[PDB]
């Protein structure tokens, strides 16, 4: 008597929660609204933890990501860097090493792909909207009402569907702010420029390299791309007004719109933003720091993913986070799947319940940390502070907590979460 | 072009392995000497720990055993218990809690089945005996030479071949002594019996449960199977001959030649070997304790599982022994391909030496441990002085010493391990 897991939503996590389901012999089927792949074209990475905590889901997912990335001597380690960008300076501020491939980095939608190439054929339905959650008694299936008019039965149900999630809709009600994200009153300027006019403007060592530049209120972060002929990047401003509602959360802008934000600031950084296309992109950063999901699960629905805790992009790691999500899911769902083996329905139902109330035990802290965590860094990195030369030594004591927070992320011991979840599943079937 | 992998021998270790490595990649093939009858009806068991290597190895290792077995209100703690078998008092005398699932058990034939489908086609060659291994320079092919005239060409060669290896006696001679087992001085009867006689004959609380009686020079091993419709017999005794110069290590004996082995025995002891059939096995038992290998590897040749260290089964695990191999065989295996993936034909070749270097290191003093203390748990489940009444204090004490060595086996910290193998490969590629 096979376990069924409706996933809503193909993305990074859902397709790897599926993969890592399958692996272990449960029944899965992923509900995906888009008719093919998305996001297409970007850079994605992901701390050696969560890299590791994709390889016990299925180690193909690790020869996916590898398939999809990018001489002789050593090996290289990973640094994030630090650069002053308000003053003439242009100080290098400080420095973090991650260590050999304590990063690793591939393009989205081709990762996406070879992920799916990965899944058995049929378990990635497209066209499939998810608009209605039907909800009868714990021994009976969780009925999935589908835009296109048709339905599905699952014995549970996984919200991995996005920021804009209609599982945590269902949870927690259309009309609640609870269910939607939320203005972080910051954007996000995008565009990529010559690695030749990256050496002019910042350095043959800057424009070669992650690099994040401080300064009050915006930071601005560059990093090589294509084989380092092209440089990609992404300035953060702030808005005090409100993103316009029902408006969309990207849109055309101008090169010198970014500009005007960066006019004050050195002079390397704003030949950078110079030498950007006339146009370019504003994209809105949303996220669930005003109104956190009070909790991730209940009954046999869980969210996963951006789902439960989208994030604002400052530690670049929202993605991880979710990959621990899918291990801790699909561990649970295999002791399920093991544990009631020739158990009655009552049984199995229960378990499933059980296993769910300790996914959320066990996450909810640390992803609703990361939520807080991720909208802190980037407080520190625009520090008003970093303009006044009579205090840009308290503002420099922040790297300490940008390394505690960072390492705090990278560090994670997926195993005693494994462990605890195991025994809080236990525990919750009066075991 | 990927790094590729001669695996000699398709026994369960050298099954698992070519799953770790084809999961990450790596182009793998099986040669196997034997048509394809495989594995025996015999059933096996796996610790908990084990088993978790079996999932980082690939998932569906774990998926194949679970579904290789049968299927079990509260949960079941497997215990491993010890009984006097010499007396008619028959008093419990020790017992061992190993947790939930601290042993999964399944059929050898059904799982090694189960293994090779989860395996993509084209991997395991049958009718492929090896007879010999031509190195050459590092950067260089090994080459493989079958029985059948026929050849293979591999990056590098690993020998999991078994008690009776050909690849242990091309490394260290056909003439040295460590190129063979020796016998241990002990062999076994084996049958069956039903669970109507086993329960008529020990009582049914025994009769249902795993037992180990103990006494002087032999002892007797029974637990339920067939889903508790029978019993299996499996009795050890102590032969002062030498086992004749190439005759076979199985063989064909009587329920009354086993009889008179435990003639002064318990009653119901002798009862449960009055059951077995008229006609039962005899089986030698060898193992690498009297010439252990002076080393699993050299070159881009390496020794897994019985080939490397088979043992004695006293402890029930030298299965579990190759699994830690393997785990750590795949782990090293993926950190050459990834870490010398566009570099020269030279790094890679040395690369991989470099990382079957690291695997002697890390894995010959445990597993040449675990041979060692298979033969010296033997020894105290067969004390002389379980037959004397006087001397019981002294023979009881013995368990101290079995709980250490089982939790030895039973807490592998495999992680560490792995982490160890990866450091020493960096040191040994001149980092
Ligand atoms: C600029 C930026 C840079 C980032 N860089 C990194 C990084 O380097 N490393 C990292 O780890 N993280 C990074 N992140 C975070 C990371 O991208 C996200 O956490 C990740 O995409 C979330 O995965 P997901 O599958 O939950 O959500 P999504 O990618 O949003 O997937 C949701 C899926 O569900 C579908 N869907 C939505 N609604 C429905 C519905 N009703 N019915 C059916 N399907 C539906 C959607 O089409 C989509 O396919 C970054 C984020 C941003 C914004
Ligand atoms: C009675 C008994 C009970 C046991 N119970 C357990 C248990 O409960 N749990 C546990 O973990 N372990 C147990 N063990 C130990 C376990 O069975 C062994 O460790 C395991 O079988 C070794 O696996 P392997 O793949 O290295 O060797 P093998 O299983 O011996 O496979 C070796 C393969 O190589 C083939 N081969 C040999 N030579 C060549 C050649 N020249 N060319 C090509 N192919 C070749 C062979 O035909 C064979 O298929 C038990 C052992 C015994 C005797
Ligand atoms: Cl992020
Ligand atoms: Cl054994």
Not at 86 to 95: A, C, I, P
Not at 154 to 169: L, W
Not at 223 to 236: D, L, W
Request: one cysteine or more; a negative charge.
């Amino acid at each position: 008597q096979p376990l069924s897991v409706g996933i809503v939503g193909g993305g990074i996590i859902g397709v790897i929660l599926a993969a890592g389901l399958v692996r272990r012999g449960i029944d899965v089927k992923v509900f995906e609204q888009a008719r093919g792949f998305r996001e297409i074209g970007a850079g994605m990475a992901f701390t050696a933890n969560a890299v590791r905590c994709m390889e016990m889901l299925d180690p193909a997912i690790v020869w996916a990501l590898r398939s999809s990335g990018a001489d002789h001597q050593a090996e290289a380690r990973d640094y994030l860097r630090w650069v002053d960008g308000y003053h003439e300076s242009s100080k290098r501020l400080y420095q973090l090493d991650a260590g050999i491939r304590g990063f690793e980095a591939c393009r989205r939608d081709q990762f996406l792909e070879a992920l799916v190439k990965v899944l058995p054929e049929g378990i990635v339905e497209c066209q499939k909207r998810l608009q209605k959650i039907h909800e009868k008694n714990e021994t009976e299936k969780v009925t999935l009402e589908f835009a296109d008019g048709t339905f599905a039965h699952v014995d549970c149900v996984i919200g991995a569907d996005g920021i804009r999630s209609r599982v945590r809709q269902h949870l927690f009600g259309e009309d609640s702010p609870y269910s939607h994200p939320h203005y972080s009153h910051k954007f996000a300027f995008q565009g990529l420029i010559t690695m030749e006019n990256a050496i002019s403007a910042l350095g043959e060592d800057k424009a070669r390299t992650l690099n994040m530049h401080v300064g009050p209120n915006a930071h601005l972060i560059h990093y090589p791309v294509a084989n380092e002929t092209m440089v990609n990047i992404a300035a953060f401003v702030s808005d005090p007004e409100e993103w316009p509602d029902k408006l969309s959360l990207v849109g055309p802008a101008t090169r010198e719109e970014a500009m005007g934000y960066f006019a004050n600031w050195n002079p390397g950084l704003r030949a950078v933003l110079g030498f950007m296309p006339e146009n370019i992109d504003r994209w809105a950063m949303f996220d669930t720091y005003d109104y956190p999901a009070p909790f991730f699960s209940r009954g046999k629905i869980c969210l996963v993913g951006d789902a439960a805790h989208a994030a604002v992009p400052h530690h670049g790691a929202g993605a991880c986070i979710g990959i621990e999500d899918a291990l801790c899911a699909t561990v649970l769902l295999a002791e399920v799947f093991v544990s009631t083996r020739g158990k009655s329905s009552i049984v199995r139902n229960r378990a499933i319940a059980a296993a769910f109330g300790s996914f959320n035990a066990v996450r909810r802290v640390r992803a609703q940390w990361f939520v807080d965590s991720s909208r802190r860094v980037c407080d520190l990195y625009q520090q008003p502070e970093w303009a006044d030369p009579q205090k840009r030594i308290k503002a420099e004591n922040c790297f300490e907590e940008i390394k505690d927070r960072s390492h705090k992320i990278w560090h994670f011991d997926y195993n005693s979460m494994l462990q605890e979840a195991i025994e809080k599943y236990r525990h919750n079937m009066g075991s």
